[PDB]
Design a protein around this ligand. Sequence first.
Ligand SMILES: COc1ccccc1S(=O)(=O)Nc1ccc2c3c(cccc13)C(=O)N2C
Length: 125
Amino acid sequence: MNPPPPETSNPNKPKRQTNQLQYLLRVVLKTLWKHQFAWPFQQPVDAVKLNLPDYYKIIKTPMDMGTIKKRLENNYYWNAQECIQDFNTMFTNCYIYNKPGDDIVLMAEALEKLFLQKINELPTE
Ligand SMILES: COc1ccccc1S(=O)(=O)Nc1ccc2c3c(cccc13)C(=O)N2C
């Protein structure tokens, strides 16, 4: 069974746009999105569709790049670190739920390397 997807808007949370957050949407996310291993991470895990009934019994802070994309498009984040933390949650969830060497983990490890490459240098204020 699927829990509700993570929020992509929250009127109680203040919004902000920065050069670094614009970069994270325009170059980091949009480039990762085109990677050949991106497709498993482009939407929230649908436990019913993918036949993973234990996913949300294990993973209590789900995150995906479709959620991050909508958050960036909506200026949901206060700063780039909050967005980077969502990316890191997405990668760590994959390592937590699976085991080393699994095909999905190899996909996540390659995307994580490309992500770290791209956020190594951010634009300034
Ligand atoms: C049951 O399906 C599969 C079984 C084996 C390999 C691949 C798939 S899958 O790619 O078709 N389904 C999945 C999509 C997204 C994810 C996972 C994870 C673990 C296992 C499956 C999947 C996971 O951490 N994420 C983010």
